[PDB]
Design a protein around this ligand. Structure first.
Ligand SMILES: [Mn+2]
Ligand SMILES: [Mn+2]
Length: 471
């Protein structure tokens, strides 16, 4: 009876979507949905709100539903395309654009989109059918140029001098030379491949370590961290909880700067794998696109090879466990399980290694279908179980943007840390890094902000169907 009250929340959710308050935009579109669940618009918007929050799964859900309650909701078809795109589902997205270019024959763009998705669908599949480095020569062939005025690997070693030089180089655009980049990649892969899936570090009674979350190519923020918290070293260790690339337009600077420090302080500088240190994700969000623009489409092939040798989780003093995503779908899972995972490869569509990089904590109890469409969500009980069954106090993960840079959930058992401030030059969130001390493994949150960067918009690489999706 209240179709007036139903649409009172169709502007009190359709409003906070303007103030980039998608968490409330969603929480109100829902209440509006609950009252009147037959309005395609409500679903269409709640879908976009899910897109802006990276909840691709749910975004696909609302989109589909919006399309059932109205086959004339062009918005719905687009919103659903984007959802599929994000999950990487090529054809599934093409079929939607196809259905649009028809109901709107004289609709420009609609063709730009169909022809665009098409190109990709053909290619993606076009690529089918051994070690990449076994090929390129490097130290051998690889020459250099006297015209090259930037950082050279002092005897292909990596020095504190090279790092600082390299960083200044990067602060001013300018790419490191291929020969050095390849050398860094080959060495880091060597070093990474010799690490167990579950790195285990022991923090002395005194002596801290710093934990950072998603970085996402936000290079000039990586530098803000190093200035604000000190450069990496044996006396000032660091650990970056995955997601160093994609979305940000300086993933190549960020990544080579991290691998660089990985080589300089391989026992005090830790990198864990994230859902985005994956080929599937790299080819939709910019890294592949960026690596090919700045180097060769073969440099990228080597990146994804080292990305597979990145540990999946790290445990500090047997008390704190940190991984990019979260806990698991299945209830078994133990610290030993993790160690014995065959990391070197792309991730399974489900299972441990998958949850380890994609799961999100949940307020309520028990698992649930992930808003993302992959892995699952988990309740405080699941966190407590795991914690207990492994003699772990709490977990530190990233994987999700957070207004205040971090978030403590599940009574303090699940901690989220995010290191990309103003996420995509649009969220406007603070970011944080954690100080973990041996004598007191209590998370010490440190917030940092904005900090300016050269032009170049987020996702300046990668086909345009995405850049046009995220904004
Ligand atoms: Mn992530
Ligand atoms: Mn992320």
């Amino acid at each position: 009876g209240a179709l007036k009250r139903a649409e009172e929340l169709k502007t009190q959710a359709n409003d906070y979507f303007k103030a980039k308050d998608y968490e409330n935009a969603i929480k109100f579109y829902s209440q509006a949905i609950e009252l009147n669940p037959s309005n395609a618009i409500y679903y269409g918007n709640r879908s976009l709100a899910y897109l802006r929050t990276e909840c691709y799964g749910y975004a696909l859900g609302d989109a589909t539903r919006a399309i059932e309650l109205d086959k004339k909701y062009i918005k719905g078809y687009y919103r659903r395309a984007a959802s599929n795109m994000a999950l990487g589902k090529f054809r599934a997205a093409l079929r939607d654009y196809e259905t649009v270019v028809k109901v709107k024959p004289h609709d420009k763009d609609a063709k730009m989109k169909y022809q665009e998705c098409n190109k990709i669908v053909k290619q993606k599949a076009f690529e089918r059918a051994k070690r990449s480095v076994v090929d390129s020569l490097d130290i051998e062939s690889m020459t250099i140029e006297d015209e090259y005025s930037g950082p050279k690997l002092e005897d292909g070693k990596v020095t504190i001098s090279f790092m600082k030089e390299l960083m200044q180089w990067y602060k001013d655009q300018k790419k490191l030379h291929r020969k050095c980049a390849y050398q860094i990649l080959v060495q880091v892969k060597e070093v990474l491949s010799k690490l167990s899936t579950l790195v285990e570090t022991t923090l002395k009674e005194t002596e801290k370590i710093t934990v950072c979350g998603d970085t996402h190519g936000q290079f000039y923020d990586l530098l803000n961290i190093f200035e604000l918290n000190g450069l990496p070293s044996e006396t000032n260790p660091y650990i970056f909880n995955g997601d160093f690339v994609d979305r940000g337009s300086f993933s190549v600077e960020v990544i080579l700067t991290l691998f660089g420090f990985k080589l300089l302080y391989p026992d005090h500088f830790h990198l864990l794998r994230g859902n985005h240190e994956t080929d599937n994700m790299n080819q939709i969000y910019g890294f592949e696109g960026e690596v090919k623009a700045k180097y060769t489409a073969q440099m990228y092939e080597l990146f994804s090879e080292v990305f597979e040798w990145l540990p999946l989780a790290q445990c500090i003093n047997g008390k704190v466990l940190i991984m990019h995503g979260g806990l698991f779908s299945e209830d078994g899972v133990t610290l030993d399980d993790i160690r014995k995972i065959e990391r070197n490869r792309q991730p399974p569509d489900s299972g441990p290694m998958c949850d380890l990089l994609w799961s999100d904590p949940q307020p309520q109890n028990g698992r649930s279908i992930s808003k993302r469409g992959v892995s699952c969500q988990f309740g405080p009980d699941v966190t407590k179980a795991f914690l207990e069954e492994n003699n772990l106090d709490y977990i530190i993960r990233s994987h999700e943007v957070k207004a205040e840079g971090y978030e403590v959930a599940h009574g303090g058992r699940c901690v989220t840390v995010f290191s990309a401030p103003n996420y995509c030059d649009q969220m406007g969130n603070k970011a944080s890094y954690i100080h973990l001390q041996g004598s007191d493994l209590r998370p010490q949150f440190h917030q940092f902000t904005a900090v300016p960067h050269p032009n170049v918009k987020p996702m300046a690489y990668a086909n345009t169907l995405l850049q046009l999706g995220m904004m």
